[PDB]
Amino acid sequence: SKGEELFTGVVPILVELDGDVNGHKFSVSGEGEGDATYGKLTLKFICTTGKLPVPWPTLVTTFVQCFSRYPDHMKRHDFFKSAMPEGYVQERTISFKDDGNYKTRAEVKFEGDTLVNRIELKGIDFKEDGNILGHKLEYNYNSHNVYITADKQKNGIKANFKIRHNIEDGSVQLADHYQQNTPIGDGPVLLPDNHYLSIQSALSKDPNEKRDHMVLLEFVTAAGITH
Ligand SMILES: [Cl-]
């Protein structure tokens, strides 16, 4: 198909986010590349407004599921690539248990040969010295499964899933995710059977970088369908 063929090689990625969490306004710019053949992502993010006012891990899911590796026998279930190049809207509510919430609206699409993720993020209801605004989350990331379903009247997909962020005392901060994607363009898009994405994510720092930043290496395989 048109859209899948755009991903057979290494694709440059740009991420741009504007955020407001409890009145803390901030922006992040990221760059890197994806190789969907291997389900592989590398991205470096820099907070361009100074210190990021929330923990970096909390923004990982918001900062391009078109880079998931869909096995050949599952190609007919890959909504994300099918929407390309015109792209998709991706909306979420991320509910931090016993704390505030993020609501995100993003558009993921090509600009030339570069895959771009532009995001608006709004966070409200955060506790001033909860785990988020108090910066009590460890700089690491657990592996998760993302459960996707068709959303046919949207001509798209949905997902609800749980992210657990380790807290510095050894506990975990749950971040419930509810997600809806909608194609932007007029080409045919794939409405998948139920399946999941299996994700691992590793966070690191660039030893040479003194701006507030995050390096992310992530591998994603679609799974849960046999034929
Ligand atoms: Cl952090």
Numbering used by the authors: 2 to 64, 68 to 231
What text does the study give?
Green fluorescent protein (GFP), which was discovered in the jellyfish Aequorea victoria, is a light-emitting protein consisting of 238 amino acids. GFP absorbs UV–blue light and emits green light. The structure consists of an 11-stranded β-barrel plugged by a chromophore [Fig. 1(a)]. The chromophore is 4-(p-hydroxybenzylidene)imidazolin-5-one, which is formed from three intrinsic residues (Ser65, Tyr66 and Gly67) in the polypeptide chain by a post-translational cyclization, dehydration and oxidation.
For the study of the A form, we used a T203I variant in which the side chain of Ile203 mimics the conformation of Thr203 in the A form of wild-type GFP. The comprehensive geometric difference between the A and B forms can be seen in the phenolate moiety. The Cζ–Oη bond in the A form is 1.365 (10) Å, which is 0.05 Å longer compared with those in the B form: 1.314 (7) Å (S65T) or 1.315 (8) Å (E222Q). For the A form, the Cζ—Oη bond in the structure we determined (T203I) was in good correspondence with the Cζ—Oη bond in most of the previously reported theoretical and crystal structures. For the H atoms, the most prominent differences between the A and B forms around the chromophore are the protonation states of His148 and Glu222. His148 is neutral (deprotonated) in the A form [Fig. 5(a)], while it is positively charged (protonated) in the B form [Fig. 5(b)]. Two H atoms of Wat3, which is bound to Oη of the chromophore, were observed in both forms. One H atom of Wat3 interacts with Ser205 in the A form, while it interacts with Oη in the B form [Supplementary Figs. S3(i) and S3(j)].
